[PDB]
Paper text:
We exploited soluble fHbp peptide V1.1 as a molecular scaffold to display the [name] VR2 loop, P1.16 (VR2 P1.16). VR2 P1.16 (YYTKDTNNNLTLVP) was inserted into six different β-turn regions in fHbp. At each VR2 P1.16 insertion site, a single amino acid was deleted from the fHbp scaffold. We determined the atomic structures of ChAs with VR2 P1.16 inserted into position 151, 294, or 309, all of which generated [name]-dependent SBA titres. All ChA scaffolds align with good agreement (route-mean-square deviations (RMSDs) range between 0.447 and 0.614) to fHbp V1.1, demonstrating that the fHbp scaffold is not perturbed by insertion of VR2 P1.16. In each structure VR2 P1.16 adopts a β-turn conformation that extends away from the fHbp scaffold. In ChAs, the VR2 N- and C-termini are effectively locked into a 'biological' β-turn peptide mimic by neighbouring fHbp β-strands, as confirmed by our atomic structures. SBA titres were detected with antisera raised against fHbpV1.1:PorA294/P1.16 when alum was used as the adjuvant, and with antisera raised against fHbpV1.1:PorA151/P1.16 (a low level of SBA from a single mouse), or fHbpV1.1:PorA309/P1.16 when MPLA was the adjuvant. Interestingly, there was no detectable IgG1 binding to [name] using sera raised against fHbpV1.1:PorA309/P1.16/MPLA, against which two mice had α-[name] SBA titres; instead this antisera contained significant levels of α-[name]-specific IgG2a and IgM (p ≤ 0.01 by two-way ANOVA). Of note, antisera raised against fHbpV1.1:PorA309/P1.16/MPLA had [name]-dependent SBA titre and contained significant levels of α-[name] IgG2a and IgM.
The recombinant subunit vaccines Bexsero and Trumenba contain an important meningococcal antigen, [name] (fHbp), which is a lipoprotein composed of two β-barrels that tightly bind domains 6 and 7 of human complement factor H (CFH). fHbp is antigenically variable; databases of genome sequences contain more than 900 different fHbp peptides, which fall into three variant groups or two subfamilies: V1 (subfamily B), V2 and V3 (both subfamily A). Here we use structure-based design to generate chimeric antigens (ChAs) against serogroup B [name]. ChAs exploit fHbp as a molecular scaffold to present the surface-exposed [name] VR2 loop, which is achieved by inserting the VR2 loop into a β-turn region in fHbp. ChAs retain epitopes from both fHbp and [name], and can elicit functional immune responses against both antigens.
Numbering used by the authors: 74 to 308, 308A, 308B, 308C, 308D, 308E, 308F, 308G, ...
Amino acid sequence: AADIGAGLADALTAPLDHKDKGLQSLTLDQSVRKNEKLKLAAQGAEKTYGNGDSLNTGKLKNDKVSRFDFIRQIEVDGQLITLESGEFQVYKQSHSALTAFQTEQIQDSEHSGKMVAKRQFRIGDIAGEHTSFDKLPEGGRATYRGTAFGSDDAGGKLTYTIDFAAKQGNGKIEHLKSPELNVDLAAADIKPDGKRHAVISGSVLYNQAEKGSYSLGIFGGKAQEVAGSAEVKTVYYTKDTNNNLTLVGIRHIGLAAKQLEHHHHHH
Ligand SMILES: [Zn+2]
Ligand SMILES: [Zn+2]
Ligand SMILES: [Zn+2]
Ligand SMILES: [Zn+2]
Ligand SMILES: [Zn+2]
């Protein structure tokens, strides 16, 4: 099987082992609200999570997308109810990781009691060892290389550069199947968030026009990694009505990159 060596069942069944390659644990917060249940399943194993529980990413492969079946549930006075089902994706780095949901079924709002087929893709948690804004490198520049992944497309390539003297970053997404998702990530400032985490929020561009927004956290004690997401907006227009109406579509992209080791001497 092509998933041999993926460690999916191991992730669902083993306790934390401090000998495993990091990131060892991914705390679930955005991925499962308080009071709900998230059931994951793969390779014959299953485990249910609540808000604050951690996934054992130490058992998964670095720099790849790991895939699990999921069922989102709530228990209401004795009855276990399905809210949503589909594929749960996890992308692991050494100091950071992220999750995402490919929905396939949701609760039906036109015929109550039923599940209905519906495809949608969203980002879950962005997790890891946040770099403090107040302890960043004081100068120089670093280049990060990694992955951009969206709905049915884990092949995108992320390049991103941070100038620590200017406290600014910029980069680009290449090689996604859908051409309008290969956007530039415009120059944007590093700022501290409410927990002093170093975070970058800016615009995305396509042939020089503004087409949405992105956010990246910086991770690791020495700013080794970036992780976060982008949102690409597309406007759709009527062609067959006298009334000119629009509809806006949003497509989400998960983002993760790392600095590469460079050839060096010890003398
Ligand atoms: Zn421990
Ligand atoms: Zn670390
Ligand atoms: Zn949004
Ligand atoms: Zn040399
Ligand atoms: Zn060395």
